[PDB]
Amino acid sequence: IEEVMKTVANTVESEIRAELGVIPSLNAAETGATSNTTPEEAIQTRAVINQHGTSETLVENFLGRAALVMMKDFEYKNHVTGTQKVQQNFFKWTINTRSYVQLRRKFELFTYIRFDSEITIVPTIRLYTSTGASYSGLPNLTLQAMFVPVGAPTPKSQDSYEWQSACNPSVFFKIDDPPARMTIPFMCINSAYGMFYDGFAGFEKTANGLYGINPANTMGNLCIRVVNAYQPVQYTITIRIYLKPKHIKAWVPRPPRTMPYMSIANTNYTGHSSAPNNVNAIVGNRTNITTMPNDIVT
Amino acid sequence: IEEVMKTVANTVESEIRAELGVIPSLNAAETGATSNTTPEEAIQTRAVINQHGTSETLVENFLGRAALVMMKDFEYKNHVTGTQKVQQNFFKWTINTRSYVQLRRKFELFTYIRFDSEITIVPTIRLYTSTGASYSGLPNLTLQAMFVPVGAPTPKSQDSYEWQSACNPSVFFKIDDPPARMTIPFMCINSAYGMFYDGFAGFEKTANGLYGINPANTMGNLCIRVVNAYQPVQYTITIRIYLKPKHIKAWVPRPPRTMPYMSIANTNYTGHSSAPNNVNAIVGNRTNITTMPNDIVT
Amino acid sequence: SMMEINNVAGSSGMERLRVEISVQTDMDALLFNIPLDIQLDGPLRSTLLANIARYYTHWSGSMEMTFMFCGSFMATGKVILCYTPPGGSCPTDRESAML
Amino acid sequence: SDRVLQLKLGNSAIVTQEAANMCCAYGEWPSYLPDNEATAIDKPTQPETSTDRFYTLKSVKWEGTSTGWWWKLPDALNQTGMFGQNVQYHYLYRSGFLCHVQCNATKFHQGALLVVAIPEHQLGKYNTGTSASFDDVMKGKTGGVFTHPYVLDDGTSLACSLIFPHQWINLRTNNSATIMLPWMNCAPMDFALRHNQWTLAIIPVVPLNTSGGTTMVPITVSIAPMCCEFNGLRNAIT
Amino acid sequence: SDRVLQLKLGNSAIVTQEAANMCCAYGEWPSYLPDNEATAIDKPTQPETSTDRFYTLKSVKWEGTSTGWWWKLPDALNQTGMFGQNVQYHYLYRSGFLCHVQCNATKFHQGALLVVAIPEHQLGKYNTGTSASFDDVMKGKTGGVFTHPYVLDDGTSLACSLIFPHQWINLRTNNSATIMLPWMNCAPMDFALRHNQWTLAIIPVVPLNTSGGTTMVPITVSIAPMCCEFNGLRNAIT
Amino acid sequence: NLIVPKEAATSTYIIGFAAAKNDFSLRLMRDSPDIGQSQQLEGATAAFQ
Amino acid sequence: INFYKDSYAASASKQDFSQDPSKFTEPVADALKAGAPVL
Amino acid sequence: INFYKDSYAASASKQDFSQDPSKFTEPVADALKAGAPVL
Ligand SMILES: CCCCCCCCCCCCC/C=C\[C@H](O)[C@H](N)CO
Numbered sequence A, B: 001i002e003e004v005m006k007t008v009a010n011t012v013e014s015e016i017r018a019e020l021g022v023i024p025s026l027n028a029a030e031t032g033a034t035s036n037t038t039p040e041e042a043i044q045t046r047a048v049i050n051q052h053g054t055s056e057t058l059v060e061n062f063l064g065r066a067a068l069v070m071m072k073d074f075e076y077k078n079h080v081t082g083t084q085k086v087q088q089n090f091f092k093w094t095i096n097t098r099s100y101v102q103l104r105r106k107f108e109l110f111t112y113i114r115f116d117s118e119i120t121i122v123p124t125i126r127l128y129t130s131t132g133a134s135y136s137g138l139p140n141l142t143l144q145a146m147f148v149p150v151g152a153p154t155p156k157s158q159d160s161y162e163w164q165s166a167c168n169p170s171v172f173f174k175i176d177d178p179p180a181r182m183t184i185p186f187m188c189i190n191s192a193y194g195m196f197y198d199g200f201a202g203f204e205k206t207a208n209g210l211y212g213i214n215p216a217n218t219m220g221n222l223c224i225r226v227v228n229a230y231q232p233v234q235y236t237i238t239i240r241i242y243l244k245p246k247h248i249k250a251w252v253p254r255p256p257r258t259m260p261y262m263s264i265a266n267t268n269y270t271g272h273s274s275a276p277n278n279v280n281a282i283v284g285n286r287t288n289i290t291t292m293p294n295d296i297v298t
Numbered sequence C: 001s002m003m004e005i006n007n008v009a010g011s012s013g014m015e016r017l018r019v020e021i022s023v024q025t026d027m028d029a030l031l032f033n034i035p036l037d038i039q040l041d042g043p044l045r046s047t048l049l050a051n052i053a054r055y056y057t058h059w060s061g062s063m064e065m066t067f068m069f070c071g072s073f074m075a076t077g078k079v080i081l082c083y084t085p086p087g088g089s090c091p092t093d094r095e096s097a098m099l
Numbered sequence D, E: 001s002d003r004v005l006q007l008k009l010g011n012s013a014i015v016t017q018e019a020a021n022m023c024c025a026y027g028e029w030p031s032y033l034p035d036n037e038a039t040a041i042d043k044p045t046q047p048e049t050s051t052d053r054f055y056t057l058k059s060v061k062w063e064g065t066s067t068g069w070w071w072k073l074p075d076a077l078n079q080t081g082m083f084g085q086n087v088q089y090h091y092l093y094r095s096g097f098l099c100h101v102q103c104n105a106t107k108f109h110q111g112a113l114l115v116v117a118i119p120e121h122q123l124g125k126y127n128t129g130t131s132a133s134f135d136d137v138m139k140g141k142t143g144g145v146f147t148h149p150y151v152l153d154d155g156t157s158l159a160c161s162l163i164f165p166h167q168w169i170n171l172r173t174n175n176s177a178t179i180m181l182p183w184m185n186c187a188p189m190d191f192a193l194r195h196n197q198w199t200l201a202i203i204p205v206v207p208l209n210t211s212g213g214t215t216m217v218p219i220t221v222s223i224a225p226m227c228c229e230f231n232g233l234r235n236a237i238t
Numbered sequence F: 001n002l003i004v005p006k007e008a009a010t011s012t013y014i015i016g017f018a019a020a021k022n023d024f025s026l027r028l029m030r031d032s033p034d035i036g037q038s039q040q041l042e043g044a045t046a047a048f049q
Numbered sequence G, H: 001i002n003f004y005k006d007s008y009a010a011s012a013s014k015q016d017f018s019q020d021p022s023k024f025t026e027p028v029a030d031a032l033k034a035g036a037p038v039l
């Protein structure tokens, strides 16, 4: 059934059992069911009123934490000098959530997750060290982060005219302010996001290039620029994006990833050269199956 | 009639139809009416309880987004040197909403719009790069934006005496503050703003110069200056004005603009040199009317 | 709103908004086809539908295409207009298209 | 009582006298798509006795060096019977499945098989950056074999795969395994020719030991689609 | 009111603005086989929107020397769509049909067609003792042409064929004919690949006269199976 | 076919129209690719003088 | 939250779900029925 | 505290204490008893 569990189960008292036809400690793993043997019928227990809560381990609390999803640096100077005719004080990012393994492995514990995304943008700034690198403080620059859905025009320069954003949502935030924050809704075309897609994203049967690419994971692009014109000195802007999911719903739990990730587009694996986390040996080796590695020397 | 539509229409079940005198799929476009043929009488449908909302596409939500309406840079130095006897640390703008095509094309989807204007002023600052361009940080300057209605005196200098603004509304905002924001009311002399005016703004019959100029679109001027006196070094001030309409009411929808704009005073057109968006060919060309350009190769 | 079904080179201005139907000398003949796309450049891209829809990213629901015959009163004809759900190539023969 | 089991679907029936139990995935039963959740508006076709019936695939030979086998669960049937024909003529598909696995031996043979149904088993490749090709995954009714079953060819682990719906075939106890799979998808329906909802995997965790008896021990898979329905009728494409 | 008519079946629809009426054969409507009359005990499959829909055959060109055309009415569809596939995979078939015939011209063209549906049109041969061969009768979707339409290729007469369900297409009045055919058989069901219940015959009783207008005047036949059901699922045979 | 009398024109035109129906919906407003700027329009910078 | 005296200062009013597709799709003098022949 | 119009803007909903360990631990057709011999 479905039970509400604010705390864990109590233990009840138990007594000597010597019955014919009753075998609580005997199971059958072939049925696909986990053993139902309880501690009170395995051993002679005392009563214990147990008040250990279960709130910290809720799925909403397990996943509802901000983690790094994107980080990228770019130069803030005058790039028009030379053979480059475009200002280029900006960058473009195609939104994905598979770039950093910490959040990725925590998401891939489920096949489908439905959540709203709380996005936090953390800018940092440094002064480039070259020749006349006489420090004069970090300027208080204003930055524009524009969400660009699929099919919308994408800026090609800092001074492009796509930055008016009559329809595209933008945030203007300064270096010295608190981090910018906004919520993206649950914006999938399906009922949930798929962490895994066992299929192809194209009707055409190409030989390779489209396995595991989910058609619905086309969230679009994030373009971030510096609104100010170039200063006489060059600075380096680093933008870190934190994603916190909320209102979370998760289905179909999966085995956690054990091999190190290799790409953001597939589940390819190689492991380490030796245990632990090796393609032949996930757990480290002990001398034999009769060896405690950490044994009390009495 | 008038119906309240929080969601879209459901689909009902449909069945085999073979009736004499009933032709749902036959229409007459000459009456000026769009076809009333519904999916349930075109094909044999299943029932579908449809819960797709219609809120995102409301006119209030379609137009109620901040977009760039003005952007202008000016020099912050001592201009009194030379043959110029006027300080000139300011600029004047005659208010129009036809300078940037993104907002303009979205407004010209209707003939008349009545709205209040939420105005947001975003200042940026840079340090001019010339000779002694030793960076020392961006000063925290205070700026004054003064609305000047029709007929009011207009400043001619940074140190003019029109900047007291006993009656003209002004905002004093600093570089490091949040952007300045204020609401302008619906300030037309008519019941609505006209996006298009098929007429002349003068009683006198001049040969040319007054077609399409709406007499009511004379909102006046925005003058912005730097309150601080000049510093020993020169800085460049860039002012970006964002307009968000609110409390919107729109009438008489119009064909969207397809040719690129050429002026802010007329609907003159030239298009591109070749399709798409050409005066003879809005849509791009395919080889023939029997050619799919994106065809699945099975 | 009208579709630029005849969006071909040589067709200029209003020529693009109309499709010529003429007396065939071959039965079961293919007259034209319309690419059912709104984001890319195609006959739909001229409609008010596609001009408002292209301000958004996602869409759902049934569409409709209305065709109008502008021949003489003494001209008769019968045409079949088929919609093919995706998954394969465009039908080029009527026996495959009527399915 | 729970060791014998007869499954009847259409014109096909299967009996077993040494079943363990029946595994219904996530405590669920296949059912048709309700009008509350549907999105395609055309009337679906629901062939019942011509599609919802057992299809027995080719058998695989269990050897001492066998690593394991898998079948992509719609893909394995797309070329088979009236189900395959409906799959070919329709854009959209939906069904559950009832998967029955047969492997019988004697009381002197030993070995264990993990019969596990993996939802959305996106296949990985070992020691390469390029993704799996169309051939590597679209094996059809033949299925594939595991390269590294210990990581489920996925960089996960076999040990944790017991989180998925599964049964064992322990030769000393039972000779068959049955798992019933509902519709797994975010969407109400899908294009059956470019996405697989389930992978049925057969993995010999304990290796077979014949011990002088019959050596050719085959494993046979029978799958019945459950509550099939199809939308978007058009011409047939393969 | 009775000159315009729209027929809708599944994902297909046909309109006509110069219909005469609709002919329902013998005042009857197609329906599924009741349990009172059935004999095969297995559960039938009843695909509705995938089989009960219009199939448009190739057009035939009406010339001045044309004698006439016929289609054996299941046989014409056995190779077409989901109906054909169900016919191939099942031993037993049952359906009605809705036959719509299209032939449009101008107000200066003239001619009349007899659209007649003949039940159990056992074809005869002229001036020979040997019976018709398999090829002579199993023409498929192409149909055949009459050798001696005046005796219906049967030693009967065309003049009396108006006892059968029929409609005319008189070019001065109407450009389409529609006939709806119930199940005609002694048996509850039949093997669709070796017996034809209906023959749709198109006979130009009054010869076409173009009179300077367009010369290529084609006749087009669209048939929708009605209330299809199938029994005895097995492998596909063609 | 198209059939016409002897004296009538043998070529005719179709106009095609398209629309949504009452079940149609749009989501996730973006910037349309149907228009864009490259330079200031005529008279745009004249508004500052 | 509106603490300003002038009512035009308020937030947007994105709440008017009434529709009338009929001024544009069927702006004719005689109402068209369903399935009945137009003209 | 939520002063936004869209309900998705709200704080997290970390409050759903219902559990069902039985879809994963005992997903079998015939319910298993306690102490009774499984199969
Ligand atoms: C006012 C908006 C401007 C700022 C826009 C920031 C967009 C950045 C979004 C980064 C993360 C978006 C995550 C969205 C969806 C899901 O997590 C993925 N489909 C993973 O399943």
Ligand SMILES: CCCCCCCCCCCCC/C=C\[C@H](O)[C@H](N)CO
Binding pocket: B069, B095, B097, B117, B119, B145, B146, B147, B169, B170, B171, B182, B184, B193, B194, B195, B217, B219, B222, B241, B243
């Ligand atoms: C305290 C006020 C000082 C700041 C004054 C800022 C004024 C800037 C206004 C820019 C946009 C005004 C738009 C007004 C009217 C309509 O949009 C136009 N008539 C277009 O129809």
